[PDB]
Amino acid sequence: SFVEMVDNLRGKSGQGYYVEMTVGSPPQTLNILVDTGSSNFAVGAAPHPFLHRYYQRQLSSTYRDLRKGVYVPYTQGKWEGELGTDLVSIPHGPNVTVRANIAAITESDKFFINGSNWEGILGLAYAEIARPDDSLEPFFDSLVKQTHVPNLFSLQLCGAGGSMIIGGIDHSLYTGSLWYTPIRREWYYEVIIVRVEINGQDLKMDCKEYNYDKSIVDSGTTNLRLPKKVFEAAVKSIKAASSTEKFPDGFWLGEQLVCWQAGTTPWNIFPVISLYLMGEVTNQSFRITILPQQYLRPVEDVATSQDDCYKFAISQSSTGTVMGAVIMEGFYVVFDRARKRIGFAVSACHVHDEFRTAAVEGPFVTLDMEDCGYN
Ligand SMILES: CCCCNC(=O)[C@H](C)C[C@H](O)[C@H](Cc1ccccc1)NC(=O)c1cc(NCCCC)nc(OC)c1
């Protein structure tokens, strides 16, 4: 019975999705960003301009110091602090309490986000990328070891809350079939993209380019991030499709925003993006189709609530493909750790106009999918 965990997430793709958690004895309540792109559980533990509250180790009778420091650098931001353990619970999660590793953040740089309403981060990926090293057991590993919570969780991120189903799959959160792609290696949630189409036209690149470095699923990043060569081809194709309208080159860099009179956004001139993922069966893939309503991120114009403004949510990467929050929105994503696979289905909170639809479709036949992984 997962109904208690439905709608247990708040926040947005721009500043992160967070779940409520309690740490220590007596319980201290904190809002924690859910991050499938990392593996450290860390909380603000000292005053900071953008923190409304923080973990007070001194007030917890169950806190234990590990006398070890830690620092984590991300694509954006970094923090350092002191490692320790304490009792942790998830109010709108499974009814259980675990002793988990906790990094008490004492200094940070461009990590906390003004007005985000979260005070910590829950890294849900594997120990291989945990800092300072892989012997620091991540939270979800601790959860599975100390309780009977099954070794999987699912994320339903919704655009303009959501759900994190801890320990299972809630069939009422999606429609259609779940399609699974193998987790290539247990460090990030690494996957293999075997084909990319824009408005049904193949990008016709060596599929190794799509995974150049790696390809990961990351709820803790906003954008779809693409390696240089793929980003240029994708932007070139998207510009061509919307060429009847003018945008400054800063828009295509995610710097500048674009606006239109409310209700006149020309969605039809922006193409759909189809990402084909390696399937579970020999020579078989499936595809997920991304609408422009996902990669044109709505941004509030505080000057005049007249227009509808958007930011281009596709950016260039030097560390491989990242399927960020705008890609996961509208899909139900199953992180099936027990079976080393990630499932995609159309979400019940799917983004839809009236002419096109986000979709998860298969099967497709794709030869030599193994040659698409970077080495
Ligand atoms: C040590 C090995 C593990 C390192 N693993 C990463 O480094 C991954 C690739 C990355 C994280 O998901 C990071 C988590 C995060 C979340 C909030 C604030 C800072 C960092 N996220 C980003 O670094 C990132 C976040 C955002 N926006 C914040 C809202 C998130 C929905 N924007 C970016 O734009 C480039 C990058």
CB of 169 closer than 6 A to ligand 1?
Answer: no
Specify the residue for token string 């209700």.
263
CA angle 33/129/94 to nearest 5° reads 45
Query: How many angstroms separate the alpha carbon of residue 159 from the centre of ligand 1?
Result: 18
Question: What percentage of the chain's residues is helix, strand, coil (to nearest 5)?
Answer: 15, 40, 45
What are the tokens at 362? 């298969």
Residues 278-308 as b/e (b if ≥16 CB within 10 A, e otherwise) read bbbeeeebbbbbbbbbbbbbbeeeeeeeebb
Structure tokens at 175: 């429609």
**Options 3.40.50.720, 2.40.70.10, 2.40.50.140, 3.40.630.30; CATH of 17-149:** 2.40.70.10
Q: What CATH architecture does domain 150-375 belong to?
A: Beta Barrel (2.40)
Q: Which member of 35, 86, 141, 308 is catalytic?
A: 35
**SS3 at position 141:** helix
Cα–Cα distance, 234 to 215 (Å, whole number): 16
Contacts of 165 (CB under 8 A, 6+ apart): 2, 5, 6, 153, 154, 155, 156, 173
Question: Is there a catalytic annotation at residue 141?
Answer: no
Separation in Å, CA 269 to CA 104, 199, 241, 243, 273: 47, 10, 6, 8, 13
Domain ranges (residues) in the chain: 17-149, 150-375
CA of 74 to the centre of ligand 1 (A): 5
**Alpha-carbon separation of residue 358 from 109, 239, 350 (angstroms):** 37, 21, 7
**What is the distance in A from the centroid of ligand 1 to the CA of 217?**
12
DSSP label of 50: T
Residue with tokens 């049904």: 200
Q: Identify the active-site residue in 86, 141, 218, 336.
A: 218
Tokens of 368: 């030599």
Q: How far is the CA of 224 from the centre of ligand 1 (A)?
A: 12
Strand, coil or helix: what is 240?
Answer: helix
State which of 12, 34, 40, 76 you would mutate to test the pocket of ligand 1, scoring each by most atoms of that ligand within 8 A of its C-beta. 76
Task: Let me know if the fold of 17-149 is the same as that of 150-375.
Answer: yes
Q: Are strands 120-123 and 41-44 parallel, antiparallel or unpaired?
A: antiparallel
Active site annotation includes 35: yes
CA distance 85 to 98: 10
**Is the shortest distance between the CB of 221 and ligand 1 below 6 Å?**
yes
